[PDB]
């Protein structure tokens, strides 16, 4: 609130950038984890048991 009173547009743009950055980072990490899990579980899914 102090920095929004100081500079409104700078504070709102850096808060929006922070939210966008953490959302893209979480989504990218989840996508990479899911892709790695898929690539590791196919050899034990195409061929059962063993």
């Amino acid at each position: 609130i102090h920095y929004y009173h100081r500079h409104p547009v700078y504070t709102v743009i850096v808060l929006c950038g922070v939210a966008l950055a953490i959302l893209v980072g979480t989504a990218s990490s989840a996508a990479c984890i899911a892709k790695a899990r898929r690539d590791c579980l196919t050899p034990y899914a195409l061929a059962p048991n063993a």
Binding site: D39, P43, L46, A47, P48, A50
Partner: protein, 154 residues
């Protein structure tokens, strides 16, 4: 034997109305080559959800109406020297499947490869003497797509 076993439980794929290969229901799991795309002929089994596996070129899924239904068991042992298949007798020569060139054609992707007791170890996806790119299941069950250097889909 192999004609008796794969009949009515190895289903073909309609690409633009003609056949382009057979889809394999093995271990209760549907799978077909990904590089060829069409529709599998029989109903109640074309509507199942189906996930891709691009690293091994096999779209894999489940058979929905019965958990086992068509059995088509698999195996991992691969004794070299004499071994069989539908169109001809594939030869497991020193770590590689080889076939005479005189048999084959366009649309030979997704061919299961049966054995003495009728279990499938490998599925041909591509390829006088010729060597065929085949997906095979080794000692630890690691689904591996072995290709003979230069290869083309059949």
């Amino acid at each position: 034997m192999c004609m008796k076993l794969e009949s009515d439980k190895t289903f073909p794929i309609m690409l633009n109305g003609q056949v382009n290969g057979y889809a394999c229901v093995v271990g209760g799991r549907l799978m077909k080559p990904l590089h060829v795309e069409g529709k599998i002929d029989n109903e109640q089994l074309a509507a199942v959800k189906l996930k891709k596996a691009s690293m091994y070129d096999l779209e894999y899924g489940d058979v929905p109406q019965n958990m086992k239904s068509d059995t088509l068991q698999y195996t991992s042992d691969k004794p070299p020297g004499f071994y069989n298949w539908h169109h001809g007798a594939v030869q497991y020569e020193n770590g590689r499947f080889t076939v005479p060139r005189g048999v084959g054609g366009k649309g030979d992707s997704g061919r299961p490869i049966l054995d003495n007791r009728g279990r499938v170890v490998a599925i041909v996806l591509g390829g006088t003497r010729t060597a065929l790119s085949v997906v095979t299941w080794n000692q630890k069950g690691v689904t591996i797509k072995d290709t003979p250097e230069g290869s083309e889909p059949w």
